[PDB]
Amino acid sequence: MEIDPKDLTFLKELGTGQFGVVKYGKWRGQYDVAIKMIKEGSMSEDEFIEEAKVMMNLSHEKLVQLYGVCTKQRPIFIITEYMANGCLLNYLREMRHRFQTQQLLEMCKDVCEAMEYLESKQFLHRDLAARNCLVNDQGVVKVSDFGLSRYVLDDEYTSSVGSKFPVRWSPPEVLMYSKFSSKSDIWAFGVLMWEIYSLGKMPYERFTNSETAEHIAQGLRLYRPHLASEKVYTIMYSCWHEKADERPTFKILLSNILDVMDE
Ligand SMILES: CC(C)(C)c1ccc(C(=O)N[C@@H]2CCCN(c3ccc(C(N)=O)c(Nc4ccc(C(=O)N5CCOCC5)cc4)n3)C2)cc1
Numbered sequence: 001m002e003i004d005p006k007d008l009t010f011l012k013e014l015g016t017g018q019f020g021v022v023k024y025g026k027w028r029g030q031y032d033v034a035i036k037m038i039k040e041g042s043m044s045e046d047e048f049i050e051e052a053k054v055m056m057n058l059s060h061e062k063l064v065q066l067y068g069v070c071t072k073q074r075p076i077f078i079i080t081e082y083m084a085n086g087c088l089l090n091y092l093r094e095m096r097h098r099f100q101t102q103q104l105l106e107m108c109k110d111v112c113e114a115m116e117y118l119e120s121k122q123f124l125h126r127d128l129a130a131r132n133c134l135v136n137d138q139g140v141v142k143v144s145d146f147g148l149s150r151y152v153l154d155d156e157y158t159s160s161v162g163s164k165f166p167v168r169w170s171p172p173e174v175l176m177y178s179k180f181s182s183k184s185d186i187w188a189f190g191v192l193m194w195e196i197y198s199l200g201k202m203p204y205e206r207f208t209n210s211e212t213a214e215h216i217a218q219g220l221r222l223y224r225p226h227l228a229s230e231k232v233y234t235i236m237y238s239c240w241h242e243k244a245d246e247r248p249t250f251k252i253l254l255s256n257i258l259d260v261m262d263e
Contacts, residue, residue: 001056003027003068003079010035014086018145018152019043020075024082032082033067040074041153048151055147058123062114064134064144083142085135092130092200099199101227102261103139107196108235109257110141115189116250118146119182126150126180128188129169130195167209168202173244175213183244189253190239197225197232231260 009026016022020039027033038045055066065081085091088107092099111133118125125132127149134144149157156162160175171187173179191203203222204212221240224233235256241247248256 001052001068002072003070003077005070005073005077008033008035008070008077008079018148018157019078027067027079031067032084034064034080034082036078036080038076038078043076043151044153045071045076045151048148051147051150054123058118058121058146060114060117062110062140062142063117063146064142080144081142083134083144084137085139087131088133088135088141089130089195089200091135092196101229104196104227105232105257105261107141108193109254109261111143111189111192112250112254112257114143115185116254118143119185119250122182123147124180124182125185125188127166127169128185128192129166130192130200133192163209165209167212168204171240171244172216172242175216179244181244182249183247186239186247186250186253189250190236191222193232193236193239194222194225197228197236199225199227201225229260231263235260 007028010023012024014022014024014034017036019042020037023035023037025033025035049069049071052069059065064083067079067081069079070077115125115128123146125143125146127145128143132143132145134142136142152158154164156164159165160178167175169188169191171184174184194203195201204215207215219242221237235253238248
């Protein structure tokens with residue numbers, strides 16, 4: 001689990017994450033890596049370092065792989081699989097690309113496979129969104145930063161009334177009671193499907209977090225994106241049931257997605 005910093009090469013900056021700057025680098029002089037710098041004071045480190053053991057064992061082709069951590073010195077580092085096309089949200093918005101309705105469904109299938117894997121290991125993401133998904137050189141979408149929101153120290157991210165909390169990806173039981181389950185990740189996956197089919201639009205555009213939370217309470221939802229067929233809309237809409245219990249599992253979702261790409 002522990003990586004010696006002598007076995008790393010720190011290079012170009014990739015951008016900014018929740019805990020600070022993310023850099024590109026090389027591990028053991030051979031492998032491409034993403035080195036996530038955790039700014040001192042941004043994370044509850046002792047709690048993360050224990051869960052990092054469990055996360056090391058989370059291994060799936062549609063999950064961004066955790067390679068290790070550097071914790072003998074501060075600021076600490078999280079070493080991960082390098083995703084050459086970066087952020088899914090920016091990738092959807094890139095006008096250079098012309099996505100076919102088939103490629104959009106394939107992106108949903110990618111995320112769904114990783115999410116079914118996490119569900120199968122009783123591991124919650126807690127912050128599933130296109131901005132928290134990454135794309136590799138092959139155009140394969142993988143889920144990233146699974147279970148990290150738990151260790152964030154900033155209350156603006158952590159409280160369901162904070163200016164940085166992911167309200168637009170949250171079910172009513174999360175907004176009202178902080179009740180996180182596999183069914184709250186299901187809701188977030190439906191919003192993520194809308195993000196893919198709308199080509200990176202911000203959900204509930206012209207609504208504030210308080211108004212979005214109020215729109216949801218009124219039983220209202222995201223409109224059908226025109227690239228989504230009736231069958232694709234039934235899938236993302238099923239994720240948004242008022243009753244967490246009536247929402248599908250990621251196994252039911254994958255089977256439904258596979259059925260519509262056969263059709
Ligand atoms: C300004 C432009 C060029 C539009 C831009 C577009 C996207 C972004 C971006 O992906 N930022 C994110 C946000 C989340 C945390 N960050 C992370 C976290 C983990 C990884 C990883 N596991 O490898 C990663 N990888 C890349 C991040 C950027 C690139 C890159 O050079 N590109 C992106 C595509 O167009 C060309 C330029 C490649 C890999 N980034 C940085 C940064 C800048």
